[PDB]
């Protein structure tokens, strides 16, 4: 939900007075979880355990979200059988906002929680490049569709104590 660029390096050593710096773009609810994910990765990808290294900077990158763009997410999730690879495309205003839509549709359909899924990459794809039809139909210049749920105006009836004189039309 946030989007952070966590920078980190192993603690300086006599053999390596200057160690290599790693940068990771991590989407997470909070800075504390973002720094845990960064170290979950560096522990496996670069053999740098959290106690071995240090986080130079966790930097929240806020985004301007005034226009809808198609964000494609490649990820790996561990199911009841085992790890699988999946590419999901979501059209959303900001990359953090589309990561929320991806993790909402990964828990609902694939039953994978945030810590099971690891995101390989997030990259904005143009209308021509969309490979998924659920996102493609919206990308076309003009979309006219009836209101999908016009019966959802039953929020009005909870207030009414459900004692309306006539049955409301939709």
């Amino acid at each position: 939900m946030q989007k952070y660029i966590v920078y980190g390096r192993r603690l300086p050593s006599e053999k390596f007075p200057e160690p290599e710096v790693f940068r990771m773009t991590i989407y997470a609810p909070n800075e504390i979880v973002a720094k845990s994910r960064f170290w979950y990765h560096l522990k496996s990808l670069k053999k740098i355990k959290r106690t071995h290294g240090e986080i130079l900077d966790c930097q929240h990158i806020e985004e301007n979200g005034d226009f809808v763009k198609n964000f494609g997410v490649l990820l790996r999730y561990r199911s009841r059988v085992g790890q699988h690879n999946m590419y999901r495309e979501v059209r959303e205003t900001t990359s953090a906002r589309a990561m929320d839509k991806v993790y909402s549709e990964m828990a609902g359909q694939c039953r994978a929680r945030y810590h099971d899924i690891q995101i390989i990459n997030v990259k904005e794809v143009a209308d021509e490049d969309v490979r998924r039809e659920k996102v493609a139909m919206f990308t076309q210049k003009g979309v006219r569709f009836p209101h999908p749920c016009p019966y959802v105006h039953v929020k009005r009836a909870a207030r009414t104590a459900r004692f309306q004189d006539r049955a409301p039309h939709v």
């Binding site: 139909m137 919206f138 076309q140 979309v143 006219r144 569709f145 009836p146 999908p148």
Partner: protein
């Protein structure tokens, strides 16, 4: 914005009216009304075509537009040419005698397998039964509605059922031979 839509074209002879999801179709052979309100469809007239358009076709709702288009067009065919479902009585040793009885409103089948039980099958309203003099031992069912003719015909075939035995060896009954849009 997904909407599985199938459009047919209304025949000029037929005059078609749609109110809600109930379609009333009248041509030369007579008016047929069918109600498709069980299904959620955007039946749209105007021009000379009917578009069915089921919006948000998530699951088996994609099946609905073709089915309804076919049904409206089966109705348009019947109100013009009419549907005939010729049925041929088949017997080995026992001549089976079918006699049209209530002024083309019922059939009485006797001497089936030398069975004392006489079977009368009434037709669904608006379907006439006759015996094709030309084909011989054949019964021609003619009506505007395809499903009334077909229901009338399958009741005919369901009454004439050999009680046990091997159905593969003992084939005797009324079997629909020709199902077609022809001759009322």
């Amino acid at each position: 914005p997904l909407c599985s839509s199938m459009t047919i074209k209304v025949p000029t002879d037929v005059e078609c009216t749609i109110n809600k999801r109930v379609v009333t179709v009248k041509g030369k052979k007579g008016t047929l009304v069918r109600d498709f309100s069980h299904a959620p469809l955007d039946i749209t007239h105007a021009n000379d075509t009917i578009s069915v358009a089921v919006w948000f076709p998530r699951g088996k709702r994609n099946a609905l537009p073709r089915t309804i288009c076919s049904h409206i067009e089966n109705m348009f065919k019947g109100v013009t040419y009419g549907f005939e479902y010729k049925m041929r009585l088949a017997y080995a040793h026992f001549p089976i005698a079918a006699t049209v009885v209530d002024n083309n409103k019922a059939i009485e089948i006797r001497n089936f397998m030398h069975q004392i039980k006489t079977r009368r099958i009434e037709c669904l309203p608006g379907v006439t039964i006759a015996m094709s003099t030309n084909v011989k031992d054949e019964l021609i069912l003619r009506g505007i509605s395809i499903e009334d003719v077909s229901h009338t015909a399958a009741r005919i075939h369901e009454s004439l059922k050999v009680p046990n035995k091997d159905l593969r060896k003992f084939l005797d009954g009324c079997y629909v031979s020709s199902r077609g849009l022809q001759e009322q």
